[PDB]
Predict the 3D structure of the following.
Amino acid sequence: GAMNSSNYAELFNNDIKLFVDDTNVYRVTVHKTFEGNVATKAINGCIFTLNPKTGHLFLKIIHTSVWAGQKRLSQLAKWKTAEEVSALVRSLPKEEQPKQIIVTRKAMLDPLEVHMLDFPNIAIRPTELRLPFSAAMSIDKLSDVVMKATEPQMVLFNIYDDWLDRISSYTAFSRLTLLLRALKTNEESAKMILLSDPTITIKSYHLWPSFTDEQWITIESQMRDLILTEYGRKYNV
Amino acid sequence: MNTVPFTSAPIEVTIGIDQYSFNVKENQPFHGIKDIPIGHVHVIHFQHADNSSMRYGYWFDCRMGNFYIQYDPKDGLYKMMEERDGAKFENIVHNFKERQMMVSYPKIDEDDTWYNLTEFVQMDKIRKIVRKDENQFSYVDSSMTTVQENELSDPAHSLNYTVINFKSREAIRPGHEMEDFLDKSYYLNTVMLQGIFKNSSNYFGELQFAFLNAMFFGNYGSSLQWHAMIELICSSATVPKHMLDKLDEILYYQIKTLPEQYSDILLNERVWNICLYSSFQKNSLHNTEKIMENKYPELL
Ligand SMILES: COc1cc(CCO)ccc1O
Ligand SMILES: COc1cc(CCO)ccc1O
């Protein structure tokens, strides 16, 4: 059934699974028309499909042309997400396909279940966790590839860089979710923390800076402070 | 006008004949029911006084044979049987009528209720849902499960309603996933009507039979079937206009007949609010929506 704090370690066992987050699939700017009405302008989006054990990020870029001439775009976006996830599973060899797909929003359950009827042995699950995957577009290199796309495109990243050489997937996921929670609560501060020191670089093939183990402790501490700080700035505490 | 005689009434029982019921006391001198209108199916049904558990009964059509009821003390219920000796039967009934030992099917002349509840129900279709081919009549009770219920345990005793499942490959064309799930017209018109039921009359017959088993026997799987068949039409954008008008009439008389105190168990809040207020056919069921709002406004 639903994925929550009680069964959190299931994410790092050896049954292949994927998280699917659709928050950034349908993205718009709202503006005034010359007549003083309001309209939307879509911008490129992305499906965030993540294997939490390996860090595999399948970033399906959703180009604005997929919305042309379509109605009820927020509803379509969920079915388009489910169509693209289903297509991804089908492309993979059997031994590499997931045994579970965890959707981060419950409105994705029926669209994905319907597109996956051909796969009765893949479990489609919701979660009670509030995961901060919406903040994926605050990662500079992910945002860059989405906005530059001129056509539909799938781009592959490891969202953990090389961390699994040194830490477990439980710890890597915890680091990822702390970084993303921070970027979501105060993007400017979070990004100041991560780049403040010009001597720590992001390798060309990475998403995050090349911190030592000790520097990651400092970074992780600074991100907790930020989240608590913003929690006080927000609630006056 | 036909007759269903009873050998006797050895145990105290409430006996239903379609929407009418009467109480019979232990060893009361009751020998059956006369003046049953020809031209419709009927259902005789029972609830024992000592054990209101298991309402049960028999669907029958007096045009298909001479049927009587006899209590079986081994199996503990009133059983329907067919009498093949025509002159025996006629002579039994005439004696019981002469001694006035039978209740009269108590239909008011103005009253089309039973016709309106059974318009599309035929015995031959009932016997394909309820499989017991050596009898011309069909037994149903409160606990019998449906084939679909069993897929989710005795097959001989199942209600073989047509399986309807909105998240199934039968309901969803490859490459029409969103279209077919949000608009079930394909599944209604092509899969079910053209493919399985052949026409809307057979579909309505099964819908009506499911409702009657749900109301008379509190059969939960029958109630699931009735609501699924309503929801499949209401969730279709493209429905023949005669079917919508007929559906409104069918449901109207089902809701009208339904006792007020059973609504909490026999009516699914989600299906009815969806069907009357959100679905494609939200504006197509004027009679049903008006009786639902005046009789069960709490549900909505
Ligand atoms: C081997 O590393 C990776 C592999 C994939 C493809 C797995 O289907 C995606 C991202 C990765 O980092
Ligand atoms: C006679 O038995 C019953 C009759 C009705 C319909 C009354 O309009 C509902 C439930 C019953 O058991």
The pocket of 4-(2-hydroxyethyl)-2-methoxyphenol (ligand 2) is lined by residues B 16, 19-21, 215-216, 257, 259 (CB under 6 Å).
